[PDB]
Each structure stands twice: as structure tokens, then as C-alpha cells.
Write a structure and sequence with these properties.
Two copies of one chain form a homodimer. With about 300 residues, chain A is an alpha/beta fold. Chain A has helices spanning about 20-30, 50-55, 70, 80-95, 125-140, 180-205, and strands spanning about 10, 35, 40-45, 105-110, 115-120, 145-150, 165-175, 210-220, 235, 255, 260-265, 290-300. In chain A, helix 1 (about 20-30) packs across helix 6 (about 180-205) and helix 5 (about 125-140) packs across helix 6. The interface between A and B is medium-sized, with 33 and 33 residues. The complex binds chloride ion (CL) (4 copies), cesium ion (4 copies) and zinc ion (2 copies). Chains A, B: Its cofactor is Zn(2+).
Chain lengths: ~300, ~300
């Protein structure tokens, strides 16, 4: 017995310098009509108002890492990081996380400086999210739309979309932080419209037969090569740069050191690097994430 | 009677989030050998240490707009912007500006999120700078190396390189702020080496015969389309994005509004837009600069 998704949010500016989501959220707040469908209206939300006003990723800490139950359930304090305070507001608005009052679905919009193209980022393999990705793939022949599965591996989910009963991140790159490209703005705007169309079809009872699809599952990160003092000793190798989701094979170059030497991948198997050279990840010690490409069977969603 | 250039500086991190210059300056500070030539050694300088440590363009104000004689000659104050304080240090180091103690040449390194490719930015048409550009063009067949002339039009020059008797900015894009690409790092490193080779040949007495070359001269800026509240109402049109230094003709699209309409260029003549969609220029109200392409005659530099 299918439950429609009637409480749906689209969040932008979770990171204040990722410009598509910032400007889409700002635009929809003045022009909500675009987010309405017959069965439901999506609420646009500017997730990090202060980082957005300042055009930076975050003020005190990364909002998209502050939505764990531990943070949300913490006793308030004047000294709390801004984004912890804001996370608690989002929990009031779209949660409380893990309870029956939480929103049905939150679509959280992101941009990356990595050449990811269009990808959906999910913290679990819930079949609805896979059907959604498949639907976007179908609506956009020739346009890659990949699903990146990032299981928290324990213990606590941490993202803004995790506050809702379900949700997903739409990530689009490459785009410099603080830069709004018309091409990505329009594409994201059209993909959001399609995601809302999908929710509408789902609500109206569309049968979604079982299928198989390739997805990418997080294996873990690789840091930039560093000096003893943890400064960069090199950066992403020219042959790896811009090649997100493409096979990286053992013995292939992953970094170029300032001293001139190549650093080769020393893994035992082929992996698929994602988020290659994201500005925001330098301080996180991630030059790229390794993923495994796996073919999964997606259960039917039938009335 | 030619005067050699013996006091030469290469400045990086004038803007703390432009990563090629940041990491080249950091690397050369530990490995200066690369900046030595028979007749002279270039001194590497990290221009904005605090913005660089924080990986942002500036802390209080843009350092590359703080080197006017007015700022440099201002009475110090605890309340002074950080970059005004730092500008005064650079004036002590490489100046004082407009006096005989100033450095012979400062090469200031920049990155832009605009697709400029390689360009040299000069605040005057001094023939040495044009010969330099021509030499780089010759050393790199097939690689555009364009000269952008940005006369202050009065009254005061404002850049870090303007502190020295002469100088120039080497600008390379596109690169996201906070991202270091190996390809641009190596290219800038090789161009710096060539600039130093040129200074060495000049010092050793190379004759530089007169020639003609095309350059681009600043006409002024065009702001993003804005709402009454000065927020973005659109961004750079997809047909203009990434097309720096290419002809923009009257009647051609320059912006795409969020409402869907195109904004067309309404100028009387063809211009050549530069710095199209630079992150740092949003707050400066510049979506691009208009330039005129002009063929100039460059005087010989003979012993
Ligand atoms: Cl489906
Ligand atoms: Cl990439
Ligand atoms: Cl020449
Ligand atoms: Cl551009
Ligand atoms: Cs509608
Ligand atoms: Cs790719
Ligand atoms: Cs040398
Ligand atoms: Cs170009
Ligand atoms: Zn993000
Ligand atoms: Zn700069």
C-alpha cells in the first residue's frame, strides 16, 4: 500500500558557495509555482543562510556534516558552531530526524569543482532512490546520471537530507565555488523539475517494475601527497584530473609531485575515483574517493 | 645604455585562494635554485600570507587594489585593514613605490575562474612588457599568450606589481579558487622560467627588434543583470561563457535571465570580453570587462 510523498523539500545553499542551489532556492522562494505538482508542492529551503550571505561553504563547520543525532540532540549553547544551531532548526523544520513527523523527502542541491557531471548521492540503497536515478537516466538519453552510494559505515548519518524519512543529494560539477554557470543552472533546474515529476507519477500510482543498474559504492578516500608538515607535496595527476567515474587501474598515475615524480595507484583492483580535486576537500584530506562499480538488482515498486 | 634587471621578485598568493601562485611561491621558498639565472636571482614572495593561510582571496580588502600611493602613504592605524598593513610591508620590501629604491621587476602570479587561458596583464604599454609577451608567444607556438592592457585611467595605479619600477601580472585560467590543477601549475612554472630566461637574455644584451602585435585594451566593465535589490537576476549566457578574448558583436546574447529571457549586447561596435564570470568579481559588479583589440607598434630595445 503505497504512501504518497506529500511533504517534500528542495534545499539549496547547504554550502553557501555552491551557486546553482543558492540561486535556485532564492528564485523559487520568490517564484514557488515551479515547485507545485497536482498531488503536492515542494517547499524551497535556503539551508545555510549565513554561509550563503557570505558566499562561503560554511561559517563554523560543514552543515552537511552536522546533522547527526548526536549534534541534533545536543544541549544548546551560545558557543555552539553556527551550523550546529542551523542544523537544529532544519531538524525542527524537516524532522525531527528519525521520527514520524519528519518530511517524506528532501532533495539537497550541490555543486562540486570536480568533473562529476550529474550524480545522485544516497546514504542508503533504498529502492525509491534507485528508481529515481533510473528515471532521470531515461529522461536524458546521452546524459550520464550516476548513483553514488555513500553508506556511513556507522554509526550516524550526517547529511541535511538524512533528517527526512528519505532524501537524496543532486550533485553537479564541475563548477567553481562562487561561480554560477547558466548551463548548470538550467540543467539542475530541469532535473529538479523531473525529480518532482517522478514523485508526482509515484504519488499517482505509477508501477515501477524491477530492473538492474550499475551504481558506484564508496570504498574510501585517498589524500593528496603531503610533506611531513602536512602541506601539499603535489596534486592530482593530469591523467586523473577530470576523470571522475572512470576506471583507475593499479599502476596508473594518480598524483604529480612538485619535485617531478609521478605517484602511481597501488591498489589491488580497478576502482572508480569520484570527487577528484574538490576545493572543499583539501582540508578534509581527500584528493578523491575510491568507489566500486557494482550492478545491483532494484526491487519493483508496485501498487 | 641598457640597465639590467637585477632586483626581480616573483610574487604568489596576492590572492590567497589562487593556487598556482600560492604553491609555486611556497615551493620556491624551499627550493630557490629554480629562480636563479647567471646575471640575477629572482626572490619568491608570498604576497598575502594570512589570506593564503586561510585560503581566501583576502581578509579585509583586496591586496591587489591596496597599493595606491594614497594607501601606502597613509598614517598607520591598529584599525587598518590587514591588506593595507601588508601592502605597506610590500612597499618596504619591493619599493618604496615611485622611488629609485624600488625593485626593477615584479612578476605577480594569478589564477582566474574565467577561461582566459594564458594572459599577461599590464597597467601601461611599456615596450619591455610587450617584447616579453611576444617572446612567450614565440616560445609556445599554438599556445595563445595575450596581452591585456589595463590603464588605470587615473589617478593611481593600485596593483602589487605597480610597487616596482616595472612589472606584470601573469594570469592563467580557468581554475577554481582553492583548486590546484597539475596542468596549470606546470604551465605557469614553465612560463615563469621563460620570463626569467627573457630577463637573462635582456641583461646579457640581446637585441630586441621592433615589431607589431595585437593587444587587448580595457574599455570598461559590464555588470551582471540585477534585481532592484542588486541580487543576480541572471548570469553569463551559455554562448558567452568561456569565450574570453573572442569577438562579442552587437545583438549577440550576453546574459540569460532566470525568468528565461536573453539579454543582448547593445554596444555600437565589436568588443572582446575578458574575465567572463570570475568568482571574485561578483561583489565587484563585473560579469566581464570589454576590451578593444588593437594592433600596436612596439619600439626596438637595442643596446
Ligand atoms: Cl524506474
Ligand atoms: Cl575532476
Ligand atoms: Cl621580442
Ligand atoms: Cl569564461
Ligand atoms: Cs507547475
Ligand atoms: Cs567524467
Ligand atoms: Cs638554474
Ligand atoms: Cs577562450
Ligand atoms: Zn556541497
Ligand atoms: Zn588574482
Amino acid at each position: 500500500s503505497r504512501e504518497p510523498l506529500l511533504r517534500v523539500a528542495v534545499t539549496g545553499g547547504t554550502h553557501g558557495n555552491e551557486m546553482c542551489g543558492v540561486y535556485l532556492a532564492r528564485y523559487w522562494l520568490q517564484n514557488p509555482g515551479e515547485l507545485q505538482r497536482p498531488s503536492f508542492s515542494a517547499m524551497p529551503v535556503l539551508a545555510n543562510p549565513a554561509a550563503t550571505a557570505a558566499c562561503c561553504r560554511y561559517l563554523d563547520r560543514d552543515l552537511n556534516r552536522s546533522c547527526t543525532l548526536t549534534f541534533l540532540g545536543s544541549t544548546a549553547t551560545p558557543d555552539d558552531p553556527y551550523e550546529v544551531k542551523r542544523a537544529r532548526e532544519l531538524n525542527q523544520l524537516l524532522g525531527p530526524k528519525g521520527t514520524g513527523q519528519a518530511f517524506d523527502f528532501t532533495l539537497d542541491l550541490h555543486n562540486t569543482t570536480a568533473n562529476t557531471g550529474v550524480c545522485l548521492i544516497s546514504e542508503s540503497n533504498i529502492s525509491f532512490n534507485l528508481h529515481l536515478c533510473h528515471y532521470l537516466q531515461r529522461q536524458n538519453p546521452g546524459m550520464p546520471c550516476r548513483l553514488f552510494l555513500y553508506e556511513p559505515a556507522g554509526t550516524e548519518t550526517f547529511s541535511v537530507e538524512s533528517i527526512s524519512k528519505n532524501g537524496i543529494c543532486l550533485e553537479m560539477g564541475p563548477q567553481p565555488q562562487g561561480v554560477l554557470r547558466a548551463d548548470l543552472f538550467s540543467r539542475m533546474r530541469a532535473l529538479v523539475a523531473s525529480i518532482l515529476d517522478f514523485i508526482e507519477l509515484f504519488n499517482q500510482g505509477m508501477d515501477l517494475p524491477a530492473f538492474e543498474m550499475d551504481i558506484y559504492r564508496n570504498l574510501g578516500s585517498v589524500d593528496f601527497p603531503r610533506t611531513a608538515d602536512g602541506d601539499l607535496a603535489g596534486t592530482v595527476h593530469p591523467q586523473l584530473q577530470d576523470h571522475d567515474f572512470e576506471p583507475l587501474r593499479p599502476g596508473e598515475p594518480i598524483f604529480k609531485l612538485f619535485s617531478g615524480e609521478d605517484v602511481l595507484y597501488e591498489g589491488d583492483s580497478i576502482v572508480y575515483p569520484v570527487f577528484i580535486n574538490e576545493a572543499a576537500y583539501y582540508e578534509k584530506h581527500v584528493a578523491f574517493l575510491k568507489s566500486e562499480k557494482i550492478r545491483v538488482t532494484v526491487p519493483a515498486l508496485l501498487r
